[PDB]
């Protein structure tokens, strides 16, 4: 990434909507990436799974036990930190595109 | 073995990150035009 | 080995996870 990205504030969309006369988007045309930014923070990721090194054809084979865990630990950082969040984006996008 | 499946489904994720970015970057267009 | 087969059936089910996610994101025809 070209850019040390610090986190965003959190979740613009706890808002509840009040008429009159004006639509409360009118704040949101004054920054061009508004919506893909919220959209953007939502994906953003605090833990991943480093890409590993493939094992090499002089290698022991190992206990399935460590095997397990290395497979738990995985699948639990991509259930909270990638598939969460993609579920997330797509509601809020739900939510914009109804309104 | 083990470790070109996690590898392939983090490339894989980061895939459908990228869908959900590009169609937030749709939205802003229509967004925009009914203001 | 019992090791080795839920090995294979976490490996089977998060798969299909990611690609009931796949089906649920290819799904959304945002217009």
């Known amino acids: 990434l070209s850019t040390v990205h610090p986190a965003s504030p959190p979740l613009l969309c706890t808002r509840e909507d009040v008429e009159v ?3 409360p988007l009118r704040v949101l045309a004054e920054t061009p990436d508004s919506f893909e930014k919220h959209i953007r923070s939502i994906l953003q990721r605090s833990v991943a799974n480093p890409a ?20 738990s630990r995985a699948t ?24 | 073995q083990l470790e070109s499946l996690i590898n392939k489904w983090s490339l894989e994720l980061e895939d459908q990150e990228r869908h959900f ?15 | 080995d019992p090791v080795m087969a839920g090995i294979g059936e976490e490996i089977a089910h998060f798969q299909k996870e990611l690609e009931e996610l796949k089906a649920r994101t290819s799904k959304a025809c945002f217009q």
């Open chain 2, 21 to 35: 970015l590009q169609q937030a970057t749709q939205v802003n267009a229509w967004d925009r035009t009914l203001i």
């Open chain 1, 21 to 23: 006369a004006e639509s």
């Open chain 1, 76 to 99: 639990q950082v991509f259930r909270e930190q990638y598939i969460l969040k993609q579920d997330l984006a797509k509601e809020e996008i739900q939510r914009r595109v109804k309104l």
């Open chain 1, 52 to 71: 590993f090194l493939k094992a090499s054809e002089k290698d022991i084979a190992p206990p399935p036990e460590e095997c397990l865990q290395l497979l």
